[PDB]
Amino acid sequence: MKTEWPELVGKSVEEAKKVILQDKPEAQIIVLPVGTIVTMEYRIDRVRIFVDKLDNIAQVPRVG
């Protein structure tokens, strides 16, 4: 199962959403600022993306 998208570092949200959905059609994509205090249970259909001030992906999106 695809669990990580290193290829999306530096891309916009729109492009990250399009690529994650091709690879993971059930994905629930959640957009958060870098540095967000996160304690969350594991959800296998969720993909969190952490974004910078210009809404570019700052780190490697991962399932969870």
Author numbering: 1 to 64
Study text:
CI2 is a small single domain protein of 64 residues, which has been extensively used as a model to understand key concepts of protein folding and stability. L49 and I57 are both part of the folding nucleus in CI2 and very important for the stability of the folded state of CI232. We, therefore, determined the crystal structures of all four CI2 variants in the wild-type to L49I/I57V double mutant cycle.
In contrast, introducing L49I, which on its own destabilizes by ΔΔGf = 3.4 ± 0.1 kJ mol−1, together with I57V results in a total stabilization of the L49I/I57V double mutant of ΔΔGf = −3.8 ± 0.1 kJ mol−1. The Ile at position 49 in L49I is oriented similarly to the Leu in wild-type and I57V. It appears that some of the destabilization of the L49I mutation is a long-range effect resulting in several less favourable interactions among residues 57-62. These negative effects are relieved in the double mutant.
